[PDB]
Design a protein around this nucleic acid. Structure first.
Lengths: 53, 23, 136, 79, 59
RNA sequence: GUUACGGCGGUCCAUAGCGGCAGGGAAACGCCCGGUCCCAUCCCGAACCCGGAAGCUAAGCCUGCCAGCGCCGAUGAUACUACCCAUCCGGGUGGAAAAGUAGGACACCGCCGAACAC
RNA sequence: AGUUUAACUGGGGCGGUUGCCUCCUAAAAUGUAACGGAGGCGCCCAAAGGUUCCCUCAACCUGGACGGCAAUCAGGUGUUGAGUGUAAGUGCACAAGGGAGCUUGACUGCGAGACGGACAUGUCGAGCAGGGACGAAAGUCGGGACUAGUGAUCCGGCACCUCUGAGUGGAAGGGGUGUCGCUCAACGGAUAAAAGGUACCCCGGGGAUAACAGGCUGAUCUUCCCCAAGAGUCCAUAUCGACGGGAUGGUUUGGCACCUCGAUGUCGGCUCGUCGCAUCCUGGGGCUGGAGCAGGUCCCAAGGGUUGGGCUGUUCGCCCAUUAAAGC
RNA sequence: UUGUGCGCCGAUAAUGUAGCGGGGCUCAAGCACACCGCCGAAGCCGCGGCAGCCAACGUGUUGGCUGGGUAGGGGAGCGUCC
RNA sequence: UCAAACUCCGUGAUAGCUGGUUCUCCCCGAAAUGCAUUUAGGUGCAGCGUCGCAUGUUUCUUGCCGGAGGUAGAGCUACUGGAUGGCCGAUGGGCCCCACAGGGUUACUGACGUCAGCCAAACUCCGAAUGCCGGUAAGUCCAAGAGUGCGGCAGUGAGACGGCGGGGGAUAAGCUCCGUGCGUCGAGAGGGAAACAGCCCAGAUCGCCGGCUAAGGCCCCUAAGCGUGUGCUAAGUGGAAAAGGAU
């Protein structure tokens, strides 16, 4: 729709040594941002991403 | 009144079999 | 006056006037009944007029049952308005009445007064009707 | 002086699409449906939208399994 | 044994099934006649189009 | 093969259910004793799990009985209806309900295992 | 100075609405309109997703400290009447409801065959491969019980690529993969960019479309009737007759929009008629709560007659003075 | 007192009978039920000519079916001038 | 002639607009619907037409077997809601015994249950016909001049009335809006209907001073029967009509 600072906010999910940004739309009135996360990159395999915007 | 009724009642004749166009 | 206290859907299609009765073709609770013969929509005010016609003709004591209730509305829409632009509001309430159906049932002793009363209540209604005894 | 109604929703073309007796290939769609009005039986699968489909070729049999109308697939006879 | 057919009316004002079924029996014009079997096929076609055909019976 | 046995299944899943009466425990189904060991409670060995067989068929379960609560259910007729006839009405060929009735029904069937036996 | 200023519409305007989901109409497949009837959306979600396992509510009856209609508890009946994130339906107890442990498949590369289909869009999809979750294994996991939750194309932006690099070598730039930027909501989106008047009006067209008139119907209006609650001192019917009901006539305000917009000249007045009777007078008559004079109501009856004046453009109306009477 | 088949009143508008199409009709020429015949169309048949599709045969004969037609598509032709 | 003269030129301006468009025969032959639309009177694609090639009966019809449906109808102590009359009276409550607690009384208001009779497009434990999807067996078969695929050439995209089913309206309209292997008109003459596009019959190759029939009709006008038989009608019914009234 637009680009307002919506409750459902943020994006970008980048990878360590894995450059395949996987995306997801989530809220931000909750605390967390330094744990969980996983997925398959290019040439590599099931390893861990950050939510890095 | 009269005119419409006589139309709609001429339709009940025998050679029409109960029906006519524009009643 | 007879109306329901609330209907779920307060704008209904017009009832059908096709077919004969399935129930109410048999006097139930009195002795001297009324039976319809045609198809018609009978309203609130008609039935009020009729029960008053009966009570002012027996005047003392003798009971009257009304096996009908106006639970189906109809919609007038306000005057001098071009057609279109919606559906009017409910203003009067009918009951459908298929032939064979019984409307009223009296319980008064003398058949003279009773038959006369039912006749006075027949002449307050739009339908051809007849009078019934509970017998076969 | 408004009729605030008027809306509606376009169709979704639901219902049976391969009735009793017919020959169906694999992955073919027997019925589209919202709920499990018709349930799967044998050689039949369910979708995401509660669609049904065939898992094995053959022909249909709308039978019941404990009060619930099922759909099945039976082996055709090889020529 | 066999049925004998005689088309009487016309196929005008008449629907698709009736028309196609007169064609089935072989009838096109009026006063045509046909010598047909009295099996279920034929009986059903006549049930369909009885108002268009007079039916007689040799047998 | 067979008995008032147990277990796994099926019927286009109540004709199979609920309730009442009587009745059975050989091996089995069970209930019961106790938390040593695996394991478990959003607290509780109540449940799940473990180790055994003092006790009882009371209950579960199986057997017969009761058509009472529920279910099943026709023929024929009627409603409705396709087609046709018919100047309004109504009608003819075919199809055919629901309800009601007569009635039915205290299920049936298959496989393995036991016990029992030639 | 150049140009825009929407469409639908039972004429246009005013109002309202335009896209998507659910239900009825919708006529037992699908589909189907109306300014027809009821609602809703332009989201949320370290879990309200995945998986393995386990359990069954609502309601009622009773007991029970504060506690009551209800709070948490215990015991029974309870096939399912609660609840399902959010509208409705279809489904869900075999649970998709409730609860607990791990957890990221809310993945990558594809996709047989099919639905629906103007077209572009849209929907499911078994199965194969890497690499994983859960589980003892079988097997399930390519988001949510399902359907709504969003917007084509162009033009630009960010990261990565072993694609190109306007003589060579680089580079800019352009590409590609993954992605972002629009109440373009008039939601298949005329431009990135645009509100109104015309009784100064002009042109082309239209009876596809309105006003006068005709026409159809007759809600409404007038005329008439049916039944009789009562009034009428009593007395239903001398007279008025309620509450309801059934028809006329086509003059009234309106409904439809069928001929006429390459012209059917529209309120009233004057002059001039002619026609109907549902009759103002005259004429004949029945009943009376008709003593008589005057009347009241009803039936038949159209031949003749049915005034002049003030105000208003007015029709209608009110008034003055007369009249046998001052008709519709 | 029931159900029926025909009937009565209610009934009633304006250029002229004028709500059988008219004369006229109950000494039915009206309603109903059966029966007999008949008239009636460019329909069907009968005698002939042309034409299109197909088929059979022979060096174009026959036969069956067919032939309303606007928007429109296709095919085959007359006529005028150089 | 002036809400911005006149003349030549651009210029043959442009119009989703009106009108007009010329010789003949032969064959086939529609549509007035859908989605979208700065769009509703226009247009694009699909639909229906023909021409050519390809595929050969795959189309259609009738019979038989298999399948889902929730319509008419009916039903409701089989759910959601409305609701008639009874039985009980909890619960409520006027009032009394007066503490008000508590004991109760009386038409009182009547849950919940219970006996009986009822209604519903958005109520359904149930559930027709037809229509529909596939299979099969024949039929038509010197044809329906069928179906499907492809390519050329288009037109239509303002539909009307009648029957059946339904919405809006006043269950009015020659009203308006949808459905329908229903029809006709459109594009279709002729006969009957007094005259009358849509009604009934019937689908026109041309000719004949030939015959038989349909719908309809046979006293004269008008060709055909003041036909046969048995009964009704007294009203000019026939040849408009209601509620209701009546030996």
């Amino acid at each position: 729709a637009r680009n307002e600072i919506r409750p459902i906010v943020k994006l970008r999910s980048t990878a360590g040594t894995g450059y395949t940004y996987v995306t997801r739309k989530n809220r931000r009135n909750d605390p967390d941002r330094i744990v969980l996360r996983k997925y398959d990159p290019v040439l590599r395999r099931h390893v861990e991403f950050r939510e890095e915007r | 009144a009269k005119r419409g009724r006589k139309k709609r009642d001429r339709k009940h004749s025998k050679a029409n079999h109960g029906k006519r166009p524009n009643a | 006056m007879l109306i329901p206290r609330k209907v779920k859907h307060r704008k209904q299609h017009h009832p059908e006037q096709r077919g004969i009765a399935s129930g109410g073709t048999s006097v139930s609770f009195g002795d001297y009944g009324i039976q319809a013969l045609e198809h018609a929509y009978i309203t609130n005010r008609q039935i009020e007029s009729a029960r008053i016609a009966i009570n002012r003709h027996i005047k003392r004591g003798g009971k009257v049952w009304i096996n009908i209730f106006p639970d189906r509305p109809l919609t007038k829409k306000p005057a001098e308005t071009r057609m279109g632009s919606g559906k009017g509001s409910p203003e009067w309430w009918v009951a459908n009445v298929k032939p064979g159906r019984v409307l009223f049932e009296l319980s008064y002793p003398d058949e003279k007064t009773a038959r006369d009363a039912l006749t006075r209540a027949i002449h307050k209604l739009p339908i051809k009707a007849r009078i019934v005894t509970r017998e076969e | 002086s408004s009729s605030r109604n008027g809306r509606d929703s376009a169709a979704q073309r639901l219902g049976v699409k391969r009735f009793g007796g017919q020959v169906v290939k694999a992955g073919e769609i027997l019925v589209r449906q919202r709920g499990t009005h018709f349930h799967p039986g044998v050689n039949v699968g369910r979708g995401g939208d509660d669609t049904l489909f065939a898992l094995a070729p053959g022909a249909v049999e709308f039978g019941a399994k404990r009060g619930r109308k099922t759909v099945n697939i039976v082996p055709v006879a090889r020529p | 044994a066999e049925l004998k057919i005689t088309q009487v009316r016309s196929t005008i004002g008449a629907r698709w099934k009736q028309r196609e079924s007169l064609r089935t029996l072989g009838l096109k014009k009026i006063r045509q006649s046909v010598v047909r079997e009295d099996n279920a096929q034929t009986r059903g076609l006549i049930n369909t189009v009885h108002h268009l055909v007079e039916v007689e019976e040799v047998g």
